[PDB]
Amino acid sequence: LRRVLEQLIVAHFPMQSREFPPGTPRFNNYVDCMKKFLDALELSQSPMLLELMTEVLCREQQHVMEELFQSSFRRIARRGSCVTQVGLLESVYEMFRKDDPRLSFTRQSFVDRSLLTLLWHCSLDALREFFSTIVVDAIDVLKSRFTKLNESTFDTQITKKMGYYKILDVMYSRLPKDDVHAKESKINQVFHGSCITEGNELTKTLIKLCYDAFTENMAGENQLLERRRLYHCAAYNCAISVICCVFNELKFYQGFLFSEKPEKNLLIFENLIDLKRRYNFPVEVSTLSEEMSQFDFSELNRHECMAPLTALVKHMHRSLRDLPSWMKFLHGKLGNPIVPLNIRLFLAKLVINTEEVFRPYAKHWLSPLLQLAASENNGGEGIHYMVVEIVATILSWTGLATPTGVPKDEVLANRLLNFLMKHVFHPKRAVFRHNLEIIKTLVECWKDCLSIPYRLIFEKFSGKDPNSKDNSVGIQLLGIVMANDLPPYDPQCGIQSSEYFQALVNNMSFVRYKEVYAAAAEVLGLILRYVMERKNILEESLCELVAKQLKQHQNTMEDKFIVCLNKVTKSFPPLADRFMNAVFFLLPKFHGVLKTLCLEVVLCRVEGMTELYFQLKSKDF
């Protein structure tokens, strides 16, 4: 049966993953036959047919109906008849275990996406039959040694050890501590006959050996390291899963699972982290059934180490001023600006997620956060997503650990603030408005060191030639800085106030596009509101400047004239007498919404105007 089924499989299937157009009936015939084969598989626990499906599972890299096979593994993973289930498990395990000339992609992907579902999805917590038949079936190959003369057997040694690591890991993923501690068929399996000691024997040497793993340095290895990285991080996953399968009853991770001593050229983190390719990082990112049946009769989250790291620190929070295991140790490993980019870049995206235990201890991990976030270390234009993550986390706990107190942190805030207003434009408007919101949050939490760069804002809005709105960033940033506080006392450190406000009224005179002069009128009138709130400054100069510009409007500009007057009067009452007779004059013939607008204008000053009623009556009130 196996022979004739294999013969038809090689008779009428393609070999590659798709090798076809997705939607041709040839593709539909292929998915038809594969659906029927899973239809046969889904209720008969056949250790012949499970091997016959898993051989055509890993033909190529990634097929189309992968999730169908995950669902069927969840189906066969519990079906009753527990002896047959472990029969399937041991069948596919032994087809993994033997040796034949193959490609090691297959030898990896078997033990990745074939039986880790079956052990993960619930078989039984009493089904320790594999836990009895695996101890002296893989500890012996675990204690092997590297045949580093021919690579073709060396990589298979690596692949077999990696498979054994992932099997031990998924086996320790779901087990209590008592059926590892007491005298059952793990200690009593690895030993011949029952012993007297408390069963904490093989656990300790297993922790020891997987800790010798992921600490053996490649200081004399430059031959095959890509699989060695997976070897090491899977060994660390083994260590954390066995220390979380035991209830880790003691303060233990100061001397274990951490704190490499590099005097003998040791390492932990630069082993498992890549350290060659920096994250290049795209920045931003009932009987009717019966009567029918009778008729029927005729990016770093996807980086192979992140998830268990997040899980272990989540356990460290959810179960248990400075801690030398991971507080002070990773503080030294992140706070030093001599470690490379990737260690700190990865170390961000765990304390970002698990900041909740860092809520009473964020002040230490806030200074190097800004140290890495401000200066150029990231790439692109500052690692956008992680940038807004870092500063959003920081200003989430506003009222604790202000960026002031450290002068380097104050000037770091200044230079980062300068940078984010420098590169701000982004011609897709939604995230541009989001960027302006970001700047609004930063300037509303900064509050102490202003460092508001003039000649920079002046450089942004000072562009002439009213045909393109390159001054729009200047006026929106003007609205941000003047929206709360911070008056523009310009000739103290920047340039003089006179040509400053003259350039602003010049940008008002840029009558080309809509929102530029609209917001120019708006924020200019709010500047007028503050400089009339404080008349100690010579406000009347810029008063007659904007009045002069309005007079140069009102001759041949009338539609723009009435609306800029409307904006500056909604900002500011007492500048209407200069043109009150003019709007009283050309009240009519402005039919449309501008009639409503100039009515809103003449609404302004009626507490002091004498004899308006004749005016309104002769002008059709």
Partner: protein, 1016 residues
């Protein structure tokens, strides 16, 4: 309004030319962002009547601005945007048009820049396309405009490219819209197109200008419309335009501009039949370039090539049908090419669909070929179509959007075949049922094609042989269970009613275009619909007080997924069967009525049965069918008098259905016994005034009674029909009220005088008496200076009626709340003046408002009733008359007509009384107590031995609700229990000939079952 219009009229009149044109361009383009984008008839109608002025307006604007050379901006923009406006408006521009014609002719005659010349001609071509031959030619003669633009082509040369295209386009359209009188000017117009074609493409030098070719061929095609050159007049210009199609269809690759392929293809797609002999020689290269251009990676050239190819294949097949001698090798190439198609080498999606249609179309002329090639087909074809759909479970890849054409090929091969291989009929009949299920996820002009295909295959698979015609019944019987199983996009039932309407009998706009049937379809449909009602078994059962009614709390069904399966069916009959009952339904009434009555009699309390019966009797009134075959007459006149007494003890919709059945007999010939029908028409108006249609059909039957029944037994029966119709006079209520007054008038003069003067004293006068002769309940509204008394009783017979019936929930609850406080108040005064003449009219509406319908008003007044019973049945206020009035109110609330919820609540109430009576009293002075349980039992005995047909049902229901009690008492559970057994047995025997429908016997049998276990 003219706001921005006045702005434009004031900026036009100044200097600085091209500046007023800039304002004109900008302002009509700003009208662009105002005119269309509000889905409104009202304010858009305001904009139309604002813009269609001829005093001001854009037409006289160019009268101010035609003699202005640099004003190219208006001459582009205003007739670009108003072209869009002319497109958006409907046909309401037909007298709004001569001014547009004069304006556009003037603007075309004085345009300046060719970069601004096109939209005035866009408006031209848009009006001349959107408005065809009509009396608009009698409005303004386009035959005058034809001579005009004949001038502006004939005395016109060196117009460079674009208007050079547009003059030929508008010229051909002038040849298209009503050319009925053009004889000798239309002679050389084809030569005029061919002259430009010759000077473009009869010399390799002077590289051919592209779009003017397509304009000339569009004009040639459009003149050929209604001047069709059949290949009988000149076989030379048809030859040369075929050569020009050939030059239009060459595969020019290394470019994107592809207009002239679409031009030649749309020329080919209309005048295909007029070609005779030039369709033969280069057919293989035509085939190859066409099939290549089916995959020409474009948007509409794809559809142009598909239409051209299928039209050409249809034409050459209709040719080779009559050319069944010469083209043997040609069809031989077609057969082998199409077999190479229909074999899956790697056929992706459409190269097989474009040949399956042609192959089934070739199967017609494939008669004298092999008699076995046709049988290699239709197993190759069925095997080919069977693999695609009917897949796994839930993913998609629909493809049944084009399966109609495959059904067409199936039918067209299957018409001429003989002796079917017939192993694949359970796949064919599993195909048509899935297609009939997959109707409502379609679109119009595909739903109707799908119906065309299904009626085509039913025309195929019925004329073959009677050994085969069973499938046409099996498929519709299965499809009924398909479309009547849905949960009551996801449809419910409302996309197949139109299907069955224009499929069953009114499919006579389907037999025209596709190369008895209605009889077979109607017969199969009625067979299936009587079949389905068999295998349902809707026998509802008991889930967890003593319920006493037919459709009571016995509610859970054995198949709770079948109630929906039948209520989907009954309306599906009601919306289908009255479609042309003029020749079909007449023989079926006896058997259908008989089966429905037999199913209805074993289970009477299921609505919709009578609805189907009502459909049958309405058709039995539509056709005549009544003269007394006599068996059905006798059957109905039995069954009506059965159900007329069966309809007593119901509440709502079973009531609605049985009354709308009872009042719908033919009854010109059921003249006897009107007295057994009038207690239904005295209720079909009384249960109106909160519901229309029963109160409509009652008048609709009183219409027929008066003019068709001889007026002699009618004449005493008018003091009962008319006097309840007066509650009206105080298709909705107003049309029916005008109908009522017309009936009441033309009913006669002497008869309608009964309507007002009948009784005048039943309950109106009792409400019009005081409830006590002397007023009581002084209430002193508390103020700061006055405290004046107001006697709190005079308003009570309005509060106590409005709290019963309002249809006004905002204060019905308020009236109940203040009435609660009012009863609390009358307790508050009488605690220290007798009111036992007031309790007697207070209580038997208080219990009805305690347990009527709603839940918050039942949350109140139920512990009120309980607490007042607790206060009444006591010792400090023992044996006053108010206890007697409460007890008597309880007892005659027990024995009463139709009020079943109140009957059962008073059963609960007498259980409450029976518990608290033995709870409260000490036997030291309880020897002369009228509250004693012996007195309650003696009252129950006098209730029991009684010829009033409800008076003992009250007692047996009381015993049903008290045999839970006295299974714990002593000194009473022993002595008179078999005496009461004798009493109940004698009343049971006296109930011999009441009716089984009244349910007394099935109550007293449970009473004696309660008796026998407690004695044993």
């Amino acid at each position: 309004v003219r706001c921005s219009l006045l702005r434009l009229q004031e900026t036009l009149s100044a200097a600085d030319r091209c500046g007023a044109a800039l304002a004109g361009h900008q302002l009509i383009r700003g009208l662009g962002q105002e005119c269309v984008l509000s889905s409104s008839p009202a304010v858009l109608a305001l904009q139309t009547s604002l813009v269609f002025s001829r005093d001001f307006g854009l037409l006289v604007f160019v009268r101010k601005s035609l003699n202005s050379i640099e004003f190219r901006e208006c001459r582009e923009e205003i007739l670009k945007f108003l072209c869009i406006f002319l497109e958006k408006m409907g046909q309401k521009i037909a007298p709004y048009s001569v001014e547009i014609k004069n304006t556009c002719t003037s603007v075309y005659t004085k345009d300046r820049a060719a970069k601004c010349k096109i939209p005035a001609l866009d408006l031209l071509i848009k009006l001349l396309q959107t408005f065809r031959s009509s009396r608009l030619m009698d409005e303004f003669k386009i035959g005058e405009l034809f001579s005009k633009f004949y001038g502006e082509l004939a005395l016109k040369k060196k117009i460079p490219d674009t208007v050079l295209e547009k003059v030929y386009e508008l010229l051909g359209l002038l040849g298209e819209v009503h050319p009925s009188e053009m004889i000798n000017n239309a002679e050389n117009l084809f030569r005029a197109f061919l002259g430009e074609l010759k000077t473009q493409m009869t010399s390799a030098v002077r590289e051919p200008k592209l779009p003017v070719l397509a304009g000339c061929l569009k004009g040639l095609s459009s003149l050929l419309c209604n001047f069709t050159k059949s290949m009988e007049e000149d076989p030379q210009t048809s030859r040369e335009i075929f050569n020009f199609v050939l030059k239009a269809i060459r595969p020019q690759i290394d470019l994107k501009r592809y207009a002239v392929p679409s031009a030649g293809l749309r020329l080919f797609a209309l005048h295909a039949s007029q070609f005779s002999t030039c369709l033969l020689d280069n057919y293989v290269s035509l085939f190859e370039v066409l099939l290549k251009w089916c995959a020409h990676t474009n948007v509409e050239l794809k559809k142009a090539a598909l239409s051209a190819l299928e039209s050409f294949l249809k034409q050459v097949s209709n040719m080779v049908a009559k050319n069944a001698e010469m083209h043997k090798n040609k069809l031989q190439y077609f057969m082998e090419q199409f077999y190479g198609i229909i074999r899956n080498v790697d056929s992706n999606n459409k190269e097989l669909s474009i040949a399956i249609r042609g192959y089934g179309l070739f199967a017609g002329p494939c008669k004298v070929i092999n008699a076995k090639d046709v049988d290699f087909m239709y197993v190759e074809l069925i095997q080919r179509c069977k693999q695609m759909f009917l897949t796994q479970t839930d993913t998609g890849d629909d493809r049944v959007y084009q399966m109609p054409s495959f059904l067409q090929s199936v039918a067209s091969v299957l018409l001429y075949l003989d002796t079917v291989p017939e192993v694949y009929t359970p796949v064919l009949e599993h195909l048509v049922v899935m297609q009939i299920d997959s109707f409502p996820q379609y679109s119009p002009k595909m739903q109707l094609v799908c119906c065309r295909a299904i009626v085509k295959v039913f025309l195929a698979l019925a004329a073959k042989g009677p050994v085969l015609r069973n499938c046409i019944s099996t498929v519709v019987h299965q499809g009924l269970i398909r479309i009547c199983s849905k949960p009551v996009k996801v449809p419910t039932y409302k996309d197949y009613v139109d299907l069955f309407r224009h499929l069953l009998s009114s499919d006579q706009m389907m037999d025209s275009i596709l190369a008895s049937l209605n009889h077979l379809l109607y017969d199969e449909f009625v067979k299936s619909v009587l079949k389905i009602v068999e295998k349902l078994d809707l026998t509802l059962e008991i889930q967890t007080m003593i319920p006493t009614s037919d459709p009571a709390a016995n509610l859970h069904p054995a198949k709770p997924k079948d109630f929906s399966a039948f209520i989907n069916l009954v309306e599906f009959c009601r919306e289908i069967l009255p479609e042309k009952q003029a020749e079909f339904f007449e023989p079926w009434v006896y058997s259908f009525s008989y089966e429905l009555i037999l199913q209805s009699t074993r289970l009477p309390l299921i609505s919709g049965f009578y609805k189907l019966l009502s459909i049958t009797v309405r058709n039995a009134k539509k056709i005549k069918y009544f003269e007394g075959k006599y068996s059905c007459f006798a059957l109905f006149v039995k069954f009506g008098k059965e159900v007329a007494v069966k309809m007593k003890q119901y509440k709502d919709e079973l009531l609605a259905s049985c009354l709308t059945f009872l009042l719908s007999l033919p009854h010109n010939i059921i003249e006897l016994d009107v007295r057994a029908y009038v207690p239904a028409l005295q209720m079909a108006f009384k249960l109106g005034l909160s519901y229309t249609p029963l109160a409509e059909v009652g008048l609709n039957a009183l219409e027929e009674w008066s003019i068709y029944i001889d007026r002699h037994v009618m004449q005493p029966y008018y003091k009962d029909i008319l006097p309840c119709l007066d509650g009206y006079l105080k298709i909705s209520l107003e049309e029916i009220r005008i109908r009522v007054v017309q009936m009441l008038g033309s009913l006669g003069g002497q008869i309608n005088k009964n309507l007002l003067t009948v009784t005048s004293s039943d309950e109106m006068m009792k409400s019009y008496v005081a409830w006590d002769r002397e007023k009581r309940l002084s209430f002193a509204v508390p103020f700061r200076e006055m405290k004046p008394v107001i006697f709190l009783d005079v308003f009570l017979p309005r509060v106590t009626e409005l709290a019963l019936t309002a249809s006004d929930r905002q204060t019905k609850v308020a009236a109940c709340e203040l009435l609660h406080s009012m009863v609390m108040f009358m307790l508050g005064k009488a605690t220290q003046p007798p009111m036992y003449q007031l309790y007697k009219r207070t209580f038997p509406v208080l219990l009805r408002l305690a347990c009527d319908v709603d839940q918050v008003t039942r949350q109140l007044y139920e512990p009120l009733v309980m607490q007042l019973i607790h206060w009444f049945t006591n010792n400090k206020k023992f044996e006053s008359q108010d206890t007697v009035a409460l007890l008597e109110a309880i007892l005659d609330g027990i024995v009463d007509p139709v009020d079943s919820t109140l009957r059962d609540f008073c059963g609960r109430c007498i259980r409450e009384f029976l518990k608290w009576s033995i709870k409260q009293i000490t036997p030291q002075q309880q020897e002369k107590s009228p509250v004693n349980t012996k007195s309650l039992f003696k009252r129950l005995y006098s209730l029991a031995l009684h010829p009033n047909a409800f008076k003992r049902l009250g007692a047996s229901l009381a015993f049903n609700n008290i045999y839970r009690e006295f299974r714990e008492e002593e000194s009473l559970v022993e002595q008179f229990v078999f005496e009461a057994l004798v009493i109940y047995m004698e009343s049971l025997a006296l109930a011999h000939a009441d009716e089984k429908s009244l349910g007394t016997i099935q109550q007293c049998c449970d009473a004696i079952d309660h008796l026998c276990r407690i004695i044993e």
